[PDB]
A paper describes a structure:
The m6A RNA modification is catalyzed in the nucleus by a multiprotein writer complex containing the putative methyltransferases METTL3 and METTL14. The m6A writer complex catalyzes the transfer of a methyl group from the donor substrate S-adenosyl methionine (SAM) to the adenine nucleobases in acceptor RNA substrates. Crucially, our structural and biochemical data imply that METTL3 is the sole catalytic subunit of the complex, while METTL14 plays non-catalytic roles in complex stabilization and substrate RNA recruitment. The structures of the METTL3-METTL14 complex reveal that the two methyltransferase subunits form a compact pseudosymmetric heterodimer with overall dimensions of 80 × 40 × 35 Å.
The truncated METTL3-METTL14 complex was crystallized and its structure solved by a single-wavelength anomalous diffraction approach utilizing the anomalous signal of native sulfur atoms. Experimentally-phased electron density maps revealed the presence of a single molecule of the donor product S-adenosyl homocysteine (SAH), serendipitously co-purified with the complex, in the METTL3 active site. However, the RNA oligonucleotide was not evident in electron density maps. The final atomic model, containing a single METTL3-METTL14 dimer in the asymmetric unit, was refined at a resolution of 1.85 Å with an Rfree of 19.0%, working R of 15.7%, and good stereochemistry. Comparisons with the structure of the SAH product-bound complex reveal that the both SAM and SAH molecules adopt very similar conformations except for a slight rotation of the ribose moiety in SAH. Additional ordering of ASL1 is observed in the SAH-bound structure, whereby Tyr406METTL3 caps the SAH product and makes a hydrogen bonding interaction with Ser511METTL3 in ASL2. Disulfide bridge formation was observed between Cys338METTL14 and Cys388METTL14.
Residue numbers in the entry:
A (entry chain A): 368 to 400, 405 to 467, 474 to 576
B (entry chain B): 117 to 136, 153 to 200, 209 to 270, 275 to 295, 309 to 395
């Protein structure tokens, strides 16, 4: 359902089978390389496989998560088919151990055989201003919307400023639960009648 | 300003809108060995003939994707790079923009390296504003992976996209490598006449001439010069 929806939760414990299937998954995990992290095993165990039948996964990585994220992508059933680079700038379009780092990477995985996506409209470089720590560029939502207009999407480890129309956002710094999709509302009430998400 | 939307609207890549040490380059130039080079068909050549063991290897296999004798990742992964790399040494592997970003990492680990940087060559199209089956986006960059084994610059190179059929990589990769001060035994595999450079041994199938002699090359690094970084003053003799 078109307007933003979200669930404050521990993504390790939420039963994501209640959320249905998504054209696009995006995640910005707190890799174990400001907030708390997930262990490599916790990441591997996330139930990403239930979220999609056919579509794309956008996975932000840095440092050794360039490798761990590739492992997770494959374990979850995806093939890496693209890699977006966000060149980090200040307001005047200047770029902000062995090398200084001017970019962050977002792996693009595919699962199944997506049909009817508008592949090739955008390019794989984002030039966008840095904002607060870990805040990814909003440009990625536009690229994803042009790629797959009007379809349902889910974001993992999002914060409040990440909620967007057509997206369901999951994260432990969101504020409560805001669900509008009647199919999701129904399945959430069955699974969590007392509104509590533990174990 | 959303440069992604702008690219969709106009064909100008977002990187078109990115805006904008000598004494050290001088020491590097002073310590550089003479350029040395060898024509060799690397698929048929025992690379163990390349001695001594190298401090830095730049590996630039001619991928088919560069063209729109090519090497596949099957071919590349079976190179025995670990047999000519020094126990402490570095590798710079041009991986392209497709499956190489995964398979090049497999190669680095196969040869005993761990990746420590991912250097991205971002190509602008300021001069010509306006397609792998699996690709989700237009690919406008290439990756050079840096690996290490054993115990000033940024990880971006921005230049204009070269003319079709030009397979050269930006010479700025040499600047980055040399500024690390990693040692003076530097090997460029799949270099060409056009990439030969002081301080480097270049080995490749298309070279028109050779001057490599293993004993002469080794004599550049015999004592007291065995351990120079390539960024310090020459050691006095006589
Ligand atoms: N176990 C967990 N379950 C859900 N969220 C978690 C979590 N562990 C950490 N997080 C949250 O994951 C987020 C990672 S930072 C995410 C940044 C976001 N993409 C942006 O653009 O701003 C943080 O909010 C952190 O608190
Ligand atoms: Mg299609």
């Amino acid at each position: 359902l078109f307007p933003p929806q979200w669930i404050c939760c521990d993504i390790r414990y939420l039963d994501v089978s209640i959320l249905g299937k998504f054209a696009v998954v995006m995640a910005d995990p707190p890799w174990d390389i400001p907030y708390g992290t997930l262990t490599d095993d916790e990441m591997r165990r996330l139930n990403i496989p239930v979220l999609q039948d056919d579509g794309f996964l956008f996975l932000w990585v840095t440092g050794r998560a360039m490798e761990l994220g590739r492992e997770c992508l494959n374990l979850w059933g995806y093939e890496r088919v693209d890699e977006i680079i966000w060149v980090k700038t200040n307001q005047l379009q200047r770029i902000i151990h062995w090398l200084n780092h001017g970019k962050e990477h977002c792996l693009v995985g595919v699962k199944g055989n997506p049909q009817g996506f508008n592949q090739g409209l955008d390019c794989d470089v984002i030039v966008a201003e840095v904002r607060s720590t870990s805040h990814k560029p909003d440009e990625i939502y536009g690229m994803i919307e042009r790629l797959s207009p009007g379809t349902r999407k889910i974001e993992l480890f999002g914060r409040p400023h990440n909620v967007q129309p057509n997206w369901i956002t999951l994260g432990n710094q969101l504020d409560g639960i805001h669900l509008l999709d009647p199919d999701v509302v129904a399945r959430f009430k069955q699974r969590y009648p007392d509104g509590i998400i533990s174990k | 300003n959303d440069y992604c939307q702008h690219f969709v609207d106009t064909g100008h890549r977002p990187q078109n809108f990115i805006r904008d040490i000598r004494l050290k380059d001088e020491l590097i130039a002073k310590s550089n060995t003479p350029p040395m080079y060898l024509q060799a068909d690397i698929e048929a050549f025992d690379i163990r003939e390349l001695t001594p063991k190298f401090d830095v290897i730049l590996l630039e296999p001619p991928l088919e994707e560069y063209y729109r004798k090519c090497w596949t990742w099957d071919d590349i992964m079976k190179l025995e790079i670990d047999e000519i790399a020094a126990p402490r040494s570095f590798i710079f592997l041009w991986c392209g923009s497709g499956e190489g970003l995964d398979l090049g990492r497999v190669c680095l680990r196969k040869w005993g390296y761990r990746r420590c940087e991912d250097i991205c060559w971002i190509k602008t199209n300021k001069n010509n504003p306006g397609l792998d089956p699996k690709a989700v986006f237009q690919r406008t960059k290439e990756h050079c992976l840096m690996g290490i084994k054993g115990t000033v610059d940024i990880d971006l190179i921005i230049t204009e996209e070269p003319e079709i059929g030009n397979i050269e990589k930006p010479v700025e990769i040499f600047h980055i490598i040399e500024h690390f001060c990693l040692g003076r035994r530097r090997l460029h595999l799949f270099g060409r006449d056009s990439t030969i450079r002081p301080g480097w041994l270049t080995v490749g199938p298309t070279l028109t001439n050779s001057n490599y002699n293993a004993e002469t090359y080794a004599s550049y690094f015999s004592a007291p010069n065995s351990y120079l970084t390539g960024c310090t003053e020459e050691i006095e003799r006589l």
